[PDB]
Write a protein that binds this DNA or RNA. Structure first.
Ligand SMILES: [K+]
Ligand SMILES: [Mg+2]
Ligand SMILES: [Mg+2]
Ligand SMILES: [Mg+2]
Ligand SMILES: [Mg+2]
Ligand SMILES: [Mg+2]
Ligand SMILES: [Mg+2]
Ligand SMILES: [Mg+2]
Lengths: 113, 50, 176
RNA sequence: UACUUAAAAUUUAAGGAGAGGGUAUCAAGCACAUUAAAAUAGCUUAAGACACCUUGCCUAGCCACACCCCCACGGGACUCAGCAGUG
RNA sequence: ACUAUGCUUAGCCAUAAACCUAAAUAAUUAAAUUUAACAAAACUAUUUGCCAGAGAACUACUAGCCAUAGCUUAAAACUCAAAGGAC
RNA sequence: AACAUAAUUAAUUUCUACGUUUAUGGAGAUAAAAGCAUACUGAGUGUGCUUGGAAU
């Protein structure tokens, strides 16, 4: 069960497109230090990921796992998890639905629905 | 010398059209077609069409 | 058009809930306070209220994104009727295009925060939302003509490949 | 080199966290994508694609070339860009 | 004296010292701060656009455009030690 | 284009033959009330606009 060669064993990014069959185009960003300014800026990379169930929507944050064997020229990752669904975020700290900086369901309540 | 400028303008636009036509022929010939796509006629875009 | 247009017999929004309580009111008084003797602005306050009830969970609140989007759909449809008679009004043509752009911006923020509300709002208001294209495409006669040929050339090449595959498979099948 | 099998030196191939010359009067490239019943219409690009121009760089050293034809079956202007010499 | 024209209704042209010559925002009036001078007291933060001596040059060429002397975009050779601003 | 021989130590042959770039009028030396845009003619005038004119 040897792991991939690619350095990016785990990459987080935003689903910027979903028009290919069973594939999601994901834009990841990393911080790179400008040598002259000594300030960090965003260098963004595009990753094709295998979305087996076509469960991804544009704008949602996702976690990708490096595939052991490249599926195709560009598809070298799979969809591990959908960290945040677009507009359907669930607060990790409390576990309650939220819509921005607000709770759709109060954490004091226990709906269990 | 405006007369020459109009003459230069009409001859410059004619070369501009031939370059456009030739660039379109390169594409289909490279793709492997021996004739341009059926029902295709390169549009004349630099002539006095308006 | 839209499914609902307020009737002429409807009362204005100020007295919509007051006249019903009053025991008996004359036909003339009802006609003075109806939408027949009111400005177009009054008829639009009734259209908006109907949409807020039919879409928003809490029609009392008008500061939600869904409510603001409903406020802009009434204005947008109003400007469109205005511009159908005043074909050369350039100030309201700017008002129409700026409200459309404002609604698209709000629908984007709504989609990113409450997707469930977003889906109902678009379905009820009949508004189609198209996502912003990642890359801007330039447009001019030379580009549109070259881009059309490239699509045509590709399609022909793929059609030839499909025909070759069918002929190749057919020959193999006969041999078998 | 030891064992008749395990430590090295040295390479090759496939890749990618990041970094890496110029011109934007080079603004579009034109198959550059995915799926794997072979369908879908996608892929790269103002966060600079494509095009063209110039340049050995990474310096205990490394890369490229070895008369020319990028190569060298073949062809041709038919060999010192080994040391020393000559025009 | 009289015309194009200024007017109207349908199409096109996309230019002004289109300048308040002040980009747009949120600050503060103290930093013992005329921080050149004249304008309009000064200064800080944020985001984008733009500038890099002068003439050559609101030019040449390229590209876009109901424009065809136009409009927008915009060099090089060249030549100099100035050009320029307020008083 | 690519078969077959052999085989009481084992081997043999096959393993082909188009297009694209470079090149042979204008602007610069030695001196031998105003303006901006635009139209017409020729700087004159027209229309709008600016004060970087003026006016108690
Ligand atoms: K060589
Ligand atoms: Mg030699
Ligand atoms: Mg060689
Ligand atoms: Mg020698
Ligand atoms: Mg030798
Ligand atoms: Mg007249
Ligand atoms: Mg040029
Ligand atoms: Mg003005």
């Amino acid at each position: 069960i040897v792991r991939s060669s690619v350095h990016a064993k785990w990459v987080v990014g935003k689903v910027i497109g979903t028009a290919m069959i069973k594939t999601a185009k994901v834009r990841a960003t990393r911080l790179v230090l400008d040598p002259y300014l000594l300030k960090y800026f965003n260098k963004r990379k595009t990753y094709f990921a295998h979305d087996a169930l076509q469960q991804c929507s544009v704008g949602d944050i996702v976690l990708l796992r490096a595939l052991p064997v490249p599926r195709s020229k560009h598809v070298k990752h799979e969809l591990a998890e959908i960290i945040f669904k677009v507009g359907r975020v669930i607060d990790p700290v409390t576990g309650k639905p939220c819509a921005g900086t607000a709770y759709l369901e109060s954490p004091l309540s226990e709906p269990r629905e | 010398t405006r007369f020459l400028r109009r003459k230069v303008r009409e001859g410059r636009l004619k070369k501009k059209q031939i370059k456009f036509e030739k660039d379109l022929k390169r594409i289909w010939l490279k793709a492997g077609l021996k004739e341009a796509p059926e029902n295709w006629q390169t549009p004349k875009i630099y002539l006095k069409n308006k | 058009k839209q499914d609902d247009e307020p009737p002429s017999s409807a009362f204005i929004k100020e007295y919509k809930d007051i006249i019903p309580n009053i025991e008996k009111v004359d036909d003339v008084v009802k006609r003075i306070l109806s939408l027949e003797m009111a400005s177009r602005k009054e008829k639009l306050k009734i259209k908006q209220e109907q949409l807020m009830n039919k879409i928003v969970e809490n029609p009392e609140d008008s500061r939600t994104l869904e409510a603001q989007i409903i406020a802009l759909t009434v204005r947008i449809r109003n400007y469109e009727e205005h511009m159908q008679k005043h074909r050369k009004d350039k100030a309201h043509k700017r008002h129409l295009l700026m409200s459309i752009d404002r609604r698209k911006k709000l629908l984007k923020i709504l989609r990113q925060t409450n997707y469930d509300v977003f889906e109902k709002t678009c379905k009820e208001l009949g508004v189609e939302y198209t996502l912003p294209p990642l890359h801007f495409q330039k447009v001019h006669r030379r580009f549109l003509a070259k881009k059309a040929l490239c699509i045509r050339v590709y399609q022909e090449v793929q059609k030839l490949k499909k025909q070759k595959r069918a002929l190749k498979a057919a020959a193999a099948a006969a041999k078998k």
